[PDB]
C-alpha cells in the first residue's frame, strides 16, 4: 500500500512491485462497505473551513492534523484488514511523523518517503 | 340507603376529574368523612378515586 499524506488530503494506492494496481477512488469494490471515510479523503475540518467552534489563537492546528491523520489511519486499517499488505507512508516529514505517532498498527509500516513531489496532483 | 366515605390521601395533585369526583362526593380534606346515598352514580365516583378514599 502507498498512503500519500498532505495537510489537505490523503490518498491510497495499491502497488505491485513497480506498477500501480489500483487507486482507491469512488469506483472501487473495496470502499463499497466502509464504516470510515473512503479515499481520497479530504481534510474538511472545522478549522479548515473556518467554522465549528475553534480559534487560531488557540494553536490547535497540530492537534487537528493529528486527529485527521488518525481518521486517515482508520480508513487505512479498515482497507488493510481485507488484504493485509505492508504500507509505505509518503508525505512531508512532519505529516509522516504525526501519522507514525497515530498509526494503530505501526509494525506494518515498512518505508517512509518524504522527498516525493506532487503529492496532491501527481498520478 | 347511605354510606360513609372518608378521605385518606390528599386530593391536591390529582387529575381534574378525580378532584371533581372528590368534590362531587362532598369530600373536602384528608380525614373528612361524608355520608352520601349508596347509588351506582355515587359508587362510580368512589370507584374513580378508590385510592384516595375509603368506604365504611
Amino acid at each position: 500500500y502507498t498512503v500519500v499524506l498532505t495537510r489537505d488530503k490523503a490518498r491510497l494506492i495499491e502497488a505491485a512491485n513497480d506498477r500501480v494496481v489500483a487507486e482507491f477512488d469512488t469506483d472501487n469494490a473495496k470502499q463499497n462497505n466502509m464504516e470510515g471515510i473512503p479515499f481520497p479523503i479530504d481534510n474538511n475540518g472545522l478549522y479548515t473551513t473556518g467554522d465549528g467552534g475553534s480559534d487560531r489563537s488557540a494553536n490547535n492546528e497540530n492537534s487537528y492534523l493529528k486527529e485527521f491523520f488518525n481518521q486517515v489511519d482508520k480508513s487505512v486499517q479498515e482497507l488493510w484488514g481485507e488484504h493485509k499488505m505492508p504500507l509505505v507512508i509518503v508525505g512531508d516529514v512532519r505529516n509522516i511523523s504525526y501519522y507514525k505517532e497515530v498509526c494503530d498498527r505501526p509494525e506494518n509500516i515498512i518505508a517512509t518517503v518524504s522527498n516525493l513531489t506532487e503529492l496532491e496532483d501527481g498520478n | 340507603k347511605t354510606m360513609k366515605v372518608t378521605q385518606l390521601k390528599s386530593g391536591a395533585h390529582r387529575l381534574k376529574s378525580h378532584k371533581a369526583s372528590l368534590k362531587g362526593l362532598g369530600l373536602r380534606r384528608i380525614n373528612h368523612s361524608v355520608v352520601v346515598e349508596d347509588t351506582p352514580s355515587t359508587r362510580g365516583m368512589v370507584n374513580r378515586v378508590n385510592y384516595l378514599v375509603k368506604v365504611e
Partner: protein, 137 residues
C-alpha cells in the same frame, strides 16, 4: 451484507422496539435454531458475520436459514455537524429483534456440531441467546 432492493422511502422514523416476538419464534424451516432472549437491533454486518461463522462450521454439509432481514435504514450524522439541517444520511440497515425471535436455523447435520456452530455465531451477536430445537406444538 444483506440490504433491501429498491425501497419505497429513503429514510424512516426511529420507532419503538417493544413487546415479545409472537411471530417468528418457532423453528419453522430447519431442525435446530438460535433464538434471541433479549431485544435490540441486528445490524447487517452482524448478520453476515454470524452467517459466515455458521457456514464455515457446517462445511457445505448442512443447510442454514436466516430469519432476520435488515430492512430498517439507520441514519447517522457525520462528525463536526451541528443539530438540525435535516435528517442525516442512511449509513446501515438493521432488523428489529424482540425476545423470542429465531435468528438462524440449521438442518441436515449432527446436533453436537450444529450446537457448536450456533454457539460460535452467538458470539458475534448483540443478544443474549438460547439454542432451541424444533417442536411439534
Amino acid at each position: 451484507m444483506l440490504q433491501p432492493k429498491r425501497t419505497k422511502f429513503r429514510k424512516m422514523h426511529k420507532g419503538r422496539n417493544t413487546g415479545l416476538a409472537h411471530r417468528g419464534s418457532t423453528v419453522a424451516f430447519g431442525q435446530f435454531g438460535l433464538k434471541s432472549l433479549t431485544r435490540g437491533r441486528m445490524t447487517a454486518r452482524q448478520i453476515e458475520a454470524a452467517r459466515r461463522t455458521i457456514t464455515r462450521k457446517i462445511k457445505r454439509g448442512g443447510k442454514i436459514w436466516i430469519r432476520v432481514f435488515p430492512d430498517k435504514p439507520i441514519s447517522n450524522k457525520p462528525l463536526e455537524v451541528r443539530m438540525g439541517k435535516g435528517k442525516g444520511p442512511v449509513e446501515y440497515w438493521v432488523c428489529e429483534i424482540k425476545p423470542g425471535k429465531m435468528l438462524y436455523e440449521l438442518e441436515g447435520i449432527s446436533e453436537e456440531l450444529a450446537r457448536e456452530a450456533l454457539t460460535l455465531a452467538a458470539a458475534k451477536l448483540p443478544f443474549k441467546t438460547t439454542i432451541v430445537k424444533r417442536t411439534i406444538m
